Amino acid sequence: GSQTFYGINYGVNENSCPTVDSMKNDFNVLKPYTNRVRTFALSVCNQASLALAATQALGMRIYLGMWIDRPDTFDNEMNALKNILANNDVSNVDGLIVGSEVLYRGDTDPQSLANYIKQVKELVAPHGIKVATADVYYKFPEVVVKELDFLMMNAFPYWEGVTIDNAADTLMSHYDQVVGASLGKPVKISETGWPSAGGNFQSSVASVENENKYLHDVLCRVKQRNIDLLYFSAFDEPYRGGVEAHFGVLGSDRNTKPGITIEAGC
Q: Which residue type does 48 have?
A: A
Q: Kindly give, in sequence order, each residue whose CB lies less than 8 Å from that of residue 95, ignoring residues fewer than 6 positions away.
A: 63, 64, 129, 130, 131, 132, 149, 150, 152
Residue 229, strand partner residues: 189
CA 185 to centroid of chain Cα atoms:
19
CA 59 to centroid of chain Cα atoms:
20
Secondary structure (3-state) at 9: strand
CB 183 within 8 A of CB 143: no
Distance CA 178, CA 151 (A): 8
CA dihedral sign, ordered 166, 172, 176, 178: positive
Inter-helix orientation angle 164-181/208-224, to 10°: 40
C-alpha distances (whole Å) from 65 to each of 37, 41, 43, 97, 265 are: 11, 5, 10, 4, 29
Short-list 192, 188, 184, CA closest to 227: 188
User: Resolution, in Å, please?
Assistant: 1.3
From the CB of residue 31, how many other CB atoms can be counted at a distance below 10 Å?
15
CA 69 to centroid of chain Cα atoms:
17
Q: Kindly give, in sequence order, each residue whose CB lies less than 8 Å from that of residue 109, ignoring residues fewer than 6 positions away.
A: none
C-alpha distances (whole Å) from 111 to each of 7, 61, 141, 145, 186 are: 30, 31, 9, 11, 21
Distance CA 252, CA 240 (A): 12
DSSP assignment letter at 173: H
Cα first-last separation, the chain: 14
CB 3 within 8 A of CB 231: no
Distance CA 188, CA 222 (A): 10
Distance CA 12, CA 57 (A): 19
Distance CA 165, CA 167 (A): 6
Half-sphere exposure of 99 (CA within 13 A, CB side): 32
Distance CA 119, CA 174 (A): 29
Distance CA 56, CA 90 (A): 9
According to the entry, how was the structure determined?
X-ray
CB 5 within 8 A of CB 61: no
How many residues are present in the chain? 266
